[PDB]
Amino acid sequence: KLDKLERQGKDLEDKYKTYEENLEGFEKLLTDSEELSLSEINEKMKAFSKDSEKLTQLMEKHKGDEKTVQSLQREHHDIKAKLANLQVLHDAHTGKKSYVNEKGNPVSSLKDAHLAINKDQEVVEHKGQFYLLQKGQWDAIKNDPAALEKAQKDYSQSKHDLATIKMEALIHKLSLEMEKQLETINDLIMSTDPKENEEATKLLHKHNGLNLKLANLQDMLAVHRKEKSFFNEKGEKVTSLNDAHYVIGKDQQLFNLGGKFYPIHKEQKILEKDGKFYLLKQGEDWESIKDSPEKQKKAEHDFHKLQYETPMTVKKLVHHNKGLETTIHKERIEELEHHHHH
Amino acid sequence: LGSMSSMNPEYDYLFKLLLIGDSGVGKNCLLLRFADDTYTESYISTIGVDFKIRTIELDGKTIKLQIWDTAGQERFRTITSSYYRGAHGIIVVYDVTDQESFNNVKQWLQEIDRYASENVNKLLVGNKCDLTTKKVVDYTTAKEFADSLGIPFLETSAKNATNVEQSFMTMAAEIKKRM
Ligand SMILES: Nc1nc2c(ncn2[C@@H]2O[C@H](COP(=O)(O)OP(=O)(O)O)[C@@H](O)[C@H]2O)c(=O)[nH]1
């Protein structure tokens, strides 16, 4: 459909403009976003609780299958963790917990909160030392260096947990906005008017724009949980998403082949031989695989697959894809416009 | 919008289909071949879902299909469960050149059990069948697996178009049977 091609021009135009607008608004999002309302908190808790129950039922249906059940339990634990984080917010909204800053003084906004504490807890701060302990129990630990260390660890753990909660809260808020978009998209798809069908595609662009904000938060969360790390353009470790060009697992390395980074396991490497590339374990080499066409083919195939798991941050990936998509479209248009002339 | 001289096409059915399976198996290429009749060898990562529309004729009826491709990296998959809402059929894709993608079919079936409606239809597709010298997944093994689940199975090539139309026609026929 030539006209579909011709339209792709503005379509890609609109898509990448929308993506870039969302990427640029990310920083402001962190500071200006609207808090979840209790109703939103309740909606997410209900949805996760239903998912939890479904997983439980599937575990029973698959009883005996250790591998399947273990997979289901991983998912269930993940949902249980999200529910417990939401429960903290619910508690804060109902007064069972209160937000405090780093000195243990109350603050209004989750944004300004360092910890959320219950009525049986207190925070003690002294010249940059921070302690979390049972309310009224300072005398029990004040002369015990091991117990003060425990109180400092507890403060840090709670602080870390609230930071997780803040990022998850922003995810849930954006998720609810995105779910509403999907209903409207369905309504538009029901139409026989091609103009409404086109509007659905434009709305999808805004939907995926919000998904880019989710994706940045998911990367920040992964690094915060010590599952992944950020790296700059030269592959040096950095602390902030703002300085990062790459994000990869702790169990991975940025392997430089031909001036490009491939994310592979630390126990792997890539071998180049006469224009072929092989993903191998550290202990293998050409001498070890030369007698086995099966090993060579598998290693080549495994190298080929690396392209499907980019190590780039969301912003860099979007820029990379823009270039590729634009180039392919321009090629198709150029062939269509010109080839028949000769 | 519709006049007497230029009327928009009507439809008798509107099915929502989801494509799932490992990154790289060819879900997006299947989508684009079916909906747009295009193909590129050049890989482009997804940053979210996509949908395309195509209307087919089957058994004396007009069926509008909205076909959704799911995201690949976990950071882009936050609200995956929402896309299953209203889905009539799920096409599970593996790559016949990639044993891992076939082994992972059981995990994808688990996602369907977790998120889909109880009556959802399923189809198994083994893609990249044109790569004859690189095939590793045995047809009979895959056919036996699909049969054990009571679901249809086709081998496809988004590149050469082999069985692409048939796959969607088969899925539409299965859904229609219960309407
Ligand atoms: N030879 C061949 N290559 C394919 C076929 N389908 C997809 N590919 C290639 O495999 C790569 C992954 O396909 P893609 O649709 O992006 O995978 P997705 O992650 O499942 O959406 C693409 O770059 C394609 O060029 C096919 O039928 N035959």
Side-chain angles (χ1 to χ4, degrees):
Chain A
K1 255 271 213 97
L2 273 62
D3 197 68
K4 101 211 169 194
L5 203 72
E6 291 290 350
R7 165 161 221 344
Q8 287 176 28
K10 160 232 181 291
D11 216 88
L12 291 180
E13 218 82 277
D14 182 85
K15 174 177 156 174
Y16 285 99
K17 179 187 296 182
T18 299
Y19 288 5
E20 290 167 359
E21 294 172 7
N22 281 269
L23 287 168
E24 288 311 295
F26 188 70
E27 165 72 11
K28 297 147 190 179
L29 179 63
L30 302 180
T31 60
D32 301 357
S33 68
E34 174 199 1
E35 273 201 21
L36 289 161
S37 70
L38 180 67
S39 59
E40 294 177 310
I41 291 167
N42 282 342
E43 182 179 349
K44 283 285 163 177
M45 295 187 199
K46 285 173 64 174
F48 285 133
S49 293
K50 180 174 183 205
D51 189 25
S52 174
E53 296 170 20
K54 180 53 122 177
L55 289 162
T56 299
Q57 293 168 5
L58 295 172
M59 288 176 202
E60 179 80 358
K61 167 174 144 172
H62 288 283
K63 179 148 192 172
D65 184 342
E66 288 291 351
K67 183 175 182 173
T68 297
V69 167
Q70 182 175 83
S71 174
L72 291 163
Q73 287 173 342
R74 292 189 186 269
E75 304 295 325
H76 182 265
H77 164 69
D78 179 54
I79 298 310
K80 169 185 281 290
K82 294 175 201 301
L83 275 167
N85 287 347
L86 280 151
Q87 184 68 60
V88 171
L89 301 179
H90 196 281
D91 288 349
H93 278 68
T94 64
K96 296 172 185 172
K97 287 190 162 180
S98 70
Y99 296 146
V100 300
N101 61 20
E102 83 287 354
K103 294 173 181 286
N105 301 127
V107 296
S108 304
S109 177
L110 180 60
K111 283 177 186 164
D112 301 317
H114 287 234
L115 286 75
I117 58 174
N118 63 47
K119 48 105 117 181
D120 297 328
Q121 294 177 301
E122 74 174 298
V123 166
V124 173
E125 185 273 347
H126 179 84
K127 292 181 166 293
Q129 307 283 330
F130 309 100
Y131 309 91
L132 177 64
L133 55 143
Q134 177 163 351
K135 186 173 287 186
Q137 292 299 305
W138 179 251
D139 286 7
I141 76 176
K142 71 180 180 192
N143 290 314
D144 181 356
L148 293 161
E149 188 170 276
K150 172 65 184 168
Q152 289 183 273
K153 193 208 175 305
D154 288 351
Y155 176 97
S156 295
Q157 179 72 52
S158 180
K159 174 78 166 316
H160 171 95
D161 291 344
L162 193 71
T164 295
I165 288 163
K166 288 189 203 179
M167 286 182 282
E168 289 192 347
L170 296 163
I171 290 170
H172 295 325
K173 185 84 179 184
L174 283 164
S175 298
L176 291 164
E177 182 175 2
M178 290 169 74
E179 297 163 34
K180 297 174 174 43
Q181 292 172 327
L182 296 175
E183 298 291 339
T184 297
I185 286 168
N186 194 254
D187 286 345
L188 290 162
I189 291 168
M190 279 174 174
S191 185
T192 56
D193 187 352
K195 305 308 191 173
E196 288 191 41
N197 289 171
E198 286 183 3
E199 285 300 317
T201 299
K202 295 187 63 181
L203 187 47
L204 180 74
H205 297 164
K206 293 180 177 55
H207 178 86
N208 281 323
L210 298 178
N211 205 45
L212 299 176
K213 291 164 174 166
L214 291 189
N216 274 157
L217 291 156
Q218 292 285 14
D219 283 334
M220 290 167 65
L221 268 170
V223 179
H224 177 69
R225 294 188 304 243
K226 312 187 302 178
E227 298 158 359
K228 298 190 181 188
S229 292
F230 286 129
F231 297 86
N232 70 13
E233 193 173 5
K234 302 156 84 156
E236 306 171 301
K237 197 166 183 300
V238 301
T239 52
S240 172
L241 173 60
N242 289 317
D243 300 310
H245 275 62
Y246 305 97
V247 56
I248 57 160
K250 302 288 201 194
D251 57 330
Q252 295 177 310
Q253 51 166 327
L254 290 173
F255 185 98
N256 183 348
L257 169 78
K260 186 173 176 179
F261 285 139
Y262 296 76
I264 60 179
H265 295 291
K266 292 199 174 190
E267 75 273 12
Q268 286 170 323
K269 53 168 186 188
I270 301 163
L271 169 67
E272 182 188 358
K273 184 168 185 70
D274 300 336
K276 294 179 191 279
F277 304 88
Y278 307 90
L279 184 62
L280 300 174
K281 293 186 179 303
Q282 291 279 334
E284 300 182 274
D285 52 20
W286 174 251
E287 305 316 316
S288 81
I289 65 176
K290 68 175 172 178
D291 294 310
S292 169
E294 185 205 84
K295 277 179 178 178
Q296 298 167 36
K297 298 177 293 200
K298 177 59 158 50
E300 265 195 282
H301 173 77
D302 292 348
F303 169 78
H304 178 79
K305 278 169 51 175
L306 295 170
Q307 62 178 339
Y308 310 137
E309 277 293 339
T310 180
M312 289 183 283
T313 56
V314 177
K315 178 190 173 198
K316 192 166 177 76
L317 177 59
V318 166
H319 185 262
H320 169 87
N321 281 357
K322 181 176 170 191
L324 296 180
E325 282 205 281
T326 299
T327 292
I328 294 169
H329 179 255
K330 287 184 56 177
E331 295 183 352
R332 286 170 174 167
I333 284 290
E334 202 267 316
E335 172 178 357
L336 192 81
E337 288 185 345
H338 170 298
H339 186 83
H340 76 286
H341 290 319
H342 302 245
Chain B
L1 209 157
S3 68
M4 310 183 341
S5 65
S6 46
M7 311 173 68
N8 299 133
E10 306 292 348
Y11 58 75
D12 301 302
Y13 296 95
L14 175 50
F15 301 158
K16 172 176 194 177
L17 306 187
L18 248 60
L19 290 155
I20 69 178
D22 285 3
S23 290
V25 301
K27 298 179 297 299
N28 196 243
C29 287
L30 285 165
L31 182 60
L32 291 175
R33 173 60 80 193
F34 182 64
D36 295 348
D37 203 13
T38 63
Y39 173 84
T40 180
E41 185 71 31
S42 295
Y43 178 71
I44 309 214
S45 308
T46 55
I47 59 68
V49 295
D50 196 16
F51 77 84
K52 296 298 177 183
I53 301 300
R54 177 164 170 187
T55 300
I56 61 175
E57 295 295 323
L58 175 66
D59 296 337
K61 293 290 174 176
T62 296
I63 305 174
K64 185 165 180 177
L65 304 174
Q66 50 172 130
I67 307 101
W68 291 70
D69 179 27
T70 48
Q73 291 185 303
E74 281 309 321
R75 63 181 162 181
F76 297 126
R77 284 169 56 79
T78 303
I79 70 160
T80 293
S81 72
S82 292
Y83 303 118
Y84 277 88
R85 291 192 67 262
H88 295 103
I90 316 295
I91 299 178
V92 179
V93 186
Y94 70 93
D95 175 350
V96 308
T97 68
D98 185 70
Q99 186 66 228
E100 176 84 340
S101 69
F102 180 74
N103 291 342
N104 284 331
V105 163
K106 291 166 182 161
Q107 294 310 122
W108 295 113
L109 287 169
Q110 165 176 305
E111 180 181 274
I112 299 169
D113 283 341
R114 184 183 180 178
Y115 294 145
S117 72
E118 179 163 347
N119 303 319
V120 78
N121 292 275
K122 296 178 270 268
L123 168 80
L124 181 63
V125 164
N127 187 51
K128 309 195 194 175
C129 69
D130 57 284
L131 298 184
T132 50
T133 71
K134 300 193 152 66
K135 189 174 183 186
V136 293
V137 183
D138 282 335
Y139 179 82
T140 62
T141 296
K143 180 65 178 183
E144 288 293 346
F145 190 84
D147 281 350
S148 75
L149 298 164
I151 71 173
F153 168 53
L154 292 95
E155 289 179 326
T156 62
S157 168
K159 181 186 184 165
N160 292 334
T162 302
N163 276 338
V164 179
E165 292 203 44
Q166 186 58 62
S167 292
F168 289 97
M169 294 289 293
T170 295
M171 171 63 79
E174 289 305 307
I175 298 163
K176 180 161 70 68
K177 287 178 183 307
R178 58 178 176 98
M179 304 266 107

PDB file of all heavy atoms in Angstrom, chain A residues 241-262:
ATOM      1  N   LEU A 241      21.884   7.752  36.165  1.00  0.00           N
ATOM      2  CA  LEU A 241      21.318   7.573  34.824  1.00  0.00           C
ATOM      3  C   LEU A 241      21.717   8.728  33.901  1.00  0.00           C
ATOM      4  O   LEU A 241      21.903   8.534  32.699  1.00  0.00           O
ATOM      5  CB  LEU A 241      19.783   7.443  34.885  1.00  0.00           C
ATOM      6  CG  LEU A 241      19.051   7.409  33.539  1.00  0.00           C
ATOM      7  CD1 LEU A 241      19.527   6.231  32.719  1.00  0.00           C
ATOM      8  CD2 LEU A 241      17.524   7.346  33.726  1.00  0.00           C
ATOM      9  N   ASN A 242      21.856   9.928  34.464  1.00  0.00           N
ATOM     10  CA  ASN A 242      22.206  11.115  33.677  1.00  0.00           C
ATOM     11  C   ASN A 242      23.563  11.034  32.973  1.00  0.00           C
ATOM     12  O   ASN A 242      23.753  11.644  31.922  1.00  0.00           O
ATOM     13  CB  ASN A 242      22.158  12.379  34.538  1.00  0.00           C
ATOM     14  CG  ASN A 242      20.742  12.787  34.908  1.00  0.00           C
ATOM     15  OD1 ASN A 242      19.832  12.760  34.076  1.00  0.00           O
ATOM     16  ND2 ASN A 242      20.552  13.174  36.164  1.00  0.00           N
ATOM     17  N   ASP A 243      24.491  10.275  33.550  1.00  0.00           N
ATOM     18  CA  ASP A 243      25.823  10.099  32.962  1.00  0.00           C
ATOM     19  C   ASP A 243      25.987   8.781  32.202  1.00  0.00           C
ATOM     20  O   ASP A 243      27.059   8.507  31.654  1.00  0.00           O
ATOM     21  CB  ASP A 243      26.891  10.186  34.052  1.00  0.00           C
ATOM     22  CG  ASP A 243      26.869  11.522  34.775  1.00  0.00           C
ATOM     23  OD1 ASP A 243      26.861  12.559  34.084  1.00  0.00           O
ATOM     24  OD2 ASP A 243      26.835  11.531  36.027  1.00  0.00           O
ATOM     25  N   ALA A 244      24.928   7.978  32.156  1.00  0.00           N
ATOM     26  CA  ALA A 244      25.022   6.630  31.578  1.00  0.00           C
ATOM     27  C   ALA A 244      24.712   6.558  30.084  1.00  0.00           C
ATOM     28  O   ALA A 244      23.834   7.256  29.587  1.00  0.00           O
ATOM     29  CB  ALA A 244      24.126   5.645  32.345  1.00  0.00           C
ATOM     30  N   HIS A 245      25.454   5.701  29.389  1.00  0.00           N
ATOM     31  CA  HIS A 245      25.187   5.347  27.998  1.00  0.00           C
ATOM     32  C   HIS A 245      24.729   3.888  27.928  1.00  0.00           C
ATOM     33  O   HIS A 245      24.077   3.474  26.961  1.00  0.00           O
ATOM     34  CB  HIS A 245      26.453   5.520  27.160  1.00  0.00           C
ATOM     35  CG  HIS A 245      26.672   6.912  26.658  1.00  0.00           C
ATOM     36  ND1 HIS A 245      26.857   7.992  27.499  1.00  0.00           N
ATOM     37  CD2 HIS A 245      26.773   7.395  25.399  1.00  0.00           C
ATOM     38  CE1 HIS A 245      27.038   9.083  26.775  1.00  0.00           C
ATOM     39  NE2 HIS A 245      26.999   8.747  25.499  1.00  0.00           N
ATOM     40  N   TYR A 246      25.095   3.107  28.948  1.00  0.00           N
ATOM     41  CA  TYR A 246      24.775   1.676  29.000  1.00  0.00           C
ATOM     42  C   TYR A 246      24.284   1.240  30.375  1.00  0.00           C
ATOM     43  O   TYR A 246      24.629   1.844  31.392  1.00  0.00           O
ATOM     44  CB  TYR A 246      25.999   0.827  28.635  1.00  0.00           C
ATOM     45  CG  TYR A 246      26.583   1.181  27.297  1.00  0.00           C
ATOM     46  CD1 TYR A 246      27.668   2.046  27.197  1.00  0.00           C
ATOM     47  CD2 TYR A 246      26.020   0.687  26.128  1.00  0.00           C
ATOM     48  CE1 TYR A 246      28.188   2.387  25.971  1.00  0.00           C
ATOM     49  CE2 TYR A 246      26.539   1.022  24.891  1.00  0.00           C
ATOM     50  CZ  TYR A 246      27.621   1.881  24.826  1.00  0.00           C
ATOM     51  OH  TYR A 246      28.147   2.217  23.604  1.00  0.00           O
ATOM     52  N   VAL A 247      23.492   0.177  30.400  1.00  0.00           N
ATOM     53  CA  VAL A 247      23.042  -0.423  31.655  1.00  0.00           C
ATOM     54  C   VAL A 247      22.990  -1.942  31.468  1.00  0.00           C
ATOM     55  O   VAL A 247      22.340  -2.432  30.541  1.00  0.00           O
ATOM     56  CB  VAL A 247      21.679   0.156  32.125  1.00  0.00           C
ATOM     57  CG1 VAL A 247      20.614   0.000  31.050  1.00  0.00           C
ATOM     58  CG2 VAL A 247      21.222  -0.508  33.434  1.00  0.00           C
ATOM     59  N   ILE A 248      23.717  -2.684  32.308  1.00  0.00           N
ATOM     60  CA  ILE A 248      23.809  -4.142  32.163  1.00  0.00           C
ATOM     61  C   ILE A 248      23.811  -4.858  33.511  1.00  0.00           C
ATOM     62  O   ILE A 248      24.009  -4.232  34.548  1.00  0.00           O
ATOM     63  CB  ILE A 248      25.073  -4.588  31.387  1.00  0.00           C
ATOM     64  CG1 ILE A 248      26.332  -4.057  32.075  1.00  0.00           C
ATOM     65  CG2 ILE A 248      25.016  -4.131  29.936  1.00  0.00           C
ATOM     66  CD1 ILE A 248      27.602  -4.827  31.690  1.00  0.00           C
ATOM     67  N   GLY A 249      23.589  -6.172  33.481  1.00  0.00           N
ATOM     68  CA  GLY A 249      23.591  -6.977  34.692  1.00  0.00           C
ATOM     69  C   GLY A 249      24.937  -7.000  35.401  1.00  0.00           C
ATOM     70  O   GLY A 249      25.995  -6.831  34.780  1.00  0.00           O
ATOM     71  N   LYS A 250      24.905  -7.223  36.712  1.00  0.00           N
ATOM     72  CA  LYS A 250      26.137  -7.386  37.486  1.00  0.00           C
ATOM     73  C   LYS A 250      26.930  -8.603  37.010  1.00  0.00           C
ATOM     74  O   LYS A 250      28.145  -8.672  37.200  1.00  0.00           O
ATOM     75  CB  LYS A 250      25.815  -7.579  38.971  1.00  0.00           C
ATOM     76  CG  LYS A 250      25.009  -6.450  39.608  1.00  0.00           C
ATOM     77  CD  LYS A 250      25.847  -5.196  39.795  1.00  0.00           C
ATOM     78  CE  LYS A 250      25.248  -4.270  40.866  1.00  0.00           C
ATOM     79  NZ  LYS A 250      25.852  -2.902  40.822  1.00  0.00           N
ATOM     80  N   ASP A 251      26.232  -9.574  36.430  1.00  0.00           N
ATOM     81  CA  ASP A 251      26.857 -10.813  35.985  1.00  0.00           C
ATOM     82  C   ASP A 251      27.370 -10.694  34.552  1.00  0.00           C
ATOM     83  O   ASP A 251      27.887 -11.658  33.991  1.00  0.00           O
ATOM     84  CB  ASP A 251      25.870 -11.982  36.092  1.00  0.00           C
ATOM     85  CG  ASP A 251      24.589 -11.740  35.315  1.00  0.00           C
ATOM     86  OD1 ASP A 251      24.176 -10.566  35.179  1.00  0.00           O
ATOM     87  OD2 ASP A 251      23.979 -12.728  34.845  1.00  0.00           O
ATOM     88  N   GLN A 252      27.231  -9.506  33.969  1.00  0.00           N
ATOM     89  CA  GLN A 252      27.649  -9.269  32.590  1.00  0.00           C
ATOM     90  C   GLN A 252      28.850  -8.342  32.480  1.00  0.00           C
ATOM     91  O   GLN A 252      29.268  -7.707  33.456  1.00  0.00           O
ATOM     92  CB  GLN A 252      26.492  -8.678  31.783  1.00  0.00           C
ATOM     93  CG  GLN A 252      25.317  -9.626  31.621  1.00  0.00           C
ATOM     94  CD  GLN A 252      24.161  -8.988  30.874  1.00  0.00           C
ATOM     95  OE1 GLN A 252      23.721  -7.881  31.211  1.00  0.00           O
ATOM     96  NE2 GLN A 252      23.658  -9.684  29.846  1.00  0.00           N
ATOM     97  N   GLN A 253      29.414  -8.275  31.277  1.00  0.00           N
ATOM     98  CA  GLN A 253      30.473  -7.318  30.976  1.00  0.00           C
ATOM     99  C   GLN A 253      30.142  -6.616  29.674  1.00  0.00           C
ATOM    100  O   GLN A 253      29.449  -7.177  28.824  1.00  0.00           O
ATOM    101  CB  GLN A 253      31.818  -8.039  30.818  1.00  0.00           C
ATOM    102  CG  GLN A 253      31.763  -9.238  29.853  1.00  0.00           C
ATOM    103  CD  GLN A 253      33.145  -9.724  29.442  1.00  0.00           C
ATOM    104  OE1 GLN A 253      34.094  -8.937  29.332  1.00  0.00           O
ATOM    105  NE2 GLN A 253      33.269 -11.025  29.235  1.00  0.00           N
ATOM    106  N   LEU A 254      30.654  -5.403  29.508  1.00  0.00           N
ATOM    107  CA  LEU A 254      30.589  -4.726  28.213  1.00  0.00           C
ATOM    108  C   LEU A 254      31.810  -5.134  27.398  1.00  0.00           C
ATOM    109  O   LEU A 254      32.897  -4.597  27.590  1.00  0.00           O
ATOM    110  CB  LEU A 254      30.581  -3.212  28.395  1.00  0.00           C
ATOM    111  CG  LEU A 254      29.305  -2.613  28.995  1.00  0.00           C
ATOM    112  CD1 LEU A 254      29.528  -1.132  29.263  1.00  0.00           C
ATOM    113  CD2 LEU A 254      28.120  -2.818  28.065  1.00  0.00           C
ATOM    114  N   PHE A 255      31.615  -6.081  26.487  1.00  0.00           N
ATOM    115  CA  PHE A 255      32.715  -6.642  25.716  1.00  0.00           C
ATOM    116  C   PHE A 255      32.893  -5.855  24.429  1.00  0.00           C
ATOM    117  O   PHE A 255      31.984  -5.793  23.606  1.00  0.00           O
ATOM    118  CB  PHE A 255      32.446  -8.117  25.404  1.00  0.00           C
ATOM    119  CG  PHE A 255      33.592  -8.805  24.717  1.00  0.00           C
ATOM    120  CD1 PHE A 255      34.484  -9.560  25.443  1.00  0.00           C
ATOM    121  CD2 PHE A 255      33.770  -8.696  23.345  1.00  0.00           C
ATOM    122  CE1 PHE A 255      35.562 -10.191  24.824  1.00  0.00           C
ATOM    123  CE2 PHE A 255      34.841  -9.329  22.712  1.00  0.00           C
ATOM    124  CZ  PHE A 255      35.731 -10.089  23.460  1.00  0.00           C
ATOM    125  N   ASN A 256      34.071  -5.263  24.254  1.00  0.00           N
ATOM    126  CA  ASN A 256      34.353  -4.458  23.072  1.00  0.00           C
ATOM    127  C   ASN A 256      34.814  -5.329  21.923  1.00  0.00           C
ATOM    128  O   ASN A 256      35.879  -5.957  21.985  1.00  0.00           O
ATOM    129  CB  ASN A 256      35.417  -3.399  23.387  1.00  0.00           C
ATOM    130  CG  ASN A 256      35.701  -2.479  22.210  1.00  0.00           C
ATOM    131  OD1 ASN A 256      35.283  -2.739  21.075  1.00  0.00           O
ATOM    132  ND2 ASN A 256      36.426  -1.394  22.476  1.00  0.00           N
ATOM    133  N   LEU A 257      33.982  -5.391  20.890  1.00  0.00           N
ATOM    134  CA  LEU A 257      34.338  -6.030  19.638  1.00  0.00           C
ATOM    135  C   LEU A 257      34.109  -5.007  18.538  1.00  0.00           C
ATOM    136  O   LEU A 257      32.998  -4.514  18.380  1.00  0.00           O
ATOM    137  CB  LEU A 257      33.449  -7.250  19.390  1.00  0.00           C
ATOM    138  CG  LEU A 257      33.554  -7.842  17.984  1.00  0.00           C
ATOM    139  CD1 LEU A 257      34.819  -8.669  17.851  1.00  0.00           C
ATOM    140  CD2 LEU A 257      32.334  -8.688  17.668  1.00  0.00           C
ATOM    141  N   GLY A 258      35.158  -4.680  17.787  1.00  0.00           N
ATOM    142  CA  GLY A 258      35.032  -3.777  16.657  1.00  0.00           C
ATOM    143  C   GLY A 258      34.491  -2.401  17.000  1.00  0.00           C
ATOM    144  O   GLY A 258      33.801  -1.784  16.186  1.00  0.00           O
ATOM    145  N   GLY A 259      34.798  -1.927  18.207  1.00  0.00           N
ATOM    146  CA  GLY A 259      34.381  -0.606  18.649  1.00  0.00           C
ATOM    147  C   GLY A 259      32.937  -0.532  19.112  1.00  0.00           C
ATOM    148  O   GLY A 259      32.369   0.558  19.250  1.00  0.00           O
ATOM    149  N   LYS A 260      32.336  -1.691  19.352  1.00  0.00           N
ATOM    150  CA  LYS A 260      30.949  -1.757  19.806  1.00  0.00           C
ATOM    151  C   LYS A 260      30.871  -2.651  21.047  1.00  0.00           C
ATOM    152  O   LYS A 260      31.593  -3.637  21.139  1.00  0.00           O
ATOM    153  CB  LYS A 260      30.076  -2.310  18.678  1.00  0.00           C
ATOM    154  CG  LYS A 260      28.589  -2.298  18.944  1.00  0.00           C
ATOM    155  CD  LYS A 260      27.829  -2.705  17.681  1.00  0.00           C
ATOM    156  CE  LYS A 260      26.332  -2.793  17.930  1.00  0.00           C
ATOM    157  NZ  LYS A 260      25.593  -3.178  16.695  1.00  0.00           N
ATOM    158  N   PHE A 261      30.006  -2.300  22.001  1.00  0.00           N
ATOM    159  CA  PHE A 261      29.861  -3.087  23.228  1.00  0.00           C
ATOM    160  C   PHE A 261      28.773  -4.161  23.110  1.00  0.00           C
ATOM    161  O   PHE A 261      27.623  -3.871  22.761  1.00  0.00           O
ATOM    162  CB  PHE A 261      29.539  -2.191  24.435  1.00  0.00           C
ATOM    163  CG  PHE A 261      30.715  -1.412  24.962  1.00  0.00           C
ATOM    164  CD1 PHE A 261      30.556  -0.095  25.361  1.00  0.00           C
ATOM    165  CD2 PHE A 261      31.963  -2.000  25.088  1.00  0.00           C
ATOM    166  CE1 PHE A 261      31.620   0.628  25.859  1.00  0.00           C
ATOM    167  CE2 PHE A 261      33.039  -1.280  25.591  1.00  0.00           C
ATOM    168  CZ  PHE A 261      32.869   0.037  25.967  1.00  0.00           C
ATOM    169  N   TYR A 262      29.150  -5.399  23.414  1.00  0.00           N
ATOM    170  CA  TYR A 262      28.219  -6.522  23.474  1.00  0.00           C
ATOM    171  C   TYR A 262      28.105  -6.980  24.914  1.00  0.00           C
ATOM    172  O   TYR A 262      29.114  -7.224  25.572  1.00  0.00           O
ATOM    173  CB  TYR A 262      28.719  -7.683  22.603  1.00  0.00           C
ATOM    174  CG  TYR A 262      28.768  -7.338  21.138  1.00  0.00           C
ATOM    175  CD1 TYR A 262      29.789  -6.543  20.633  1.00  0.00           C
ATOM    176  CD2 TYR A 262      27.788  -7.797  20.259  1.00  0.00           C
ATOM    177  CE1 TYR A 262      29.839  -6.217  19.298  1.00  0.00           C
ATOM    178  CE2 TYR A 262      27.830  -7.472  18.916  1.00  0.00           C
ATOM    179  CZ  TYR A 262      28.859  -6.679  18.447  1.00  0.00           C
ATOM    180  OH  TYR A 262      28.916  -6.350  17.118  1.00  0.00           O
TER     181      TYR A 262
END
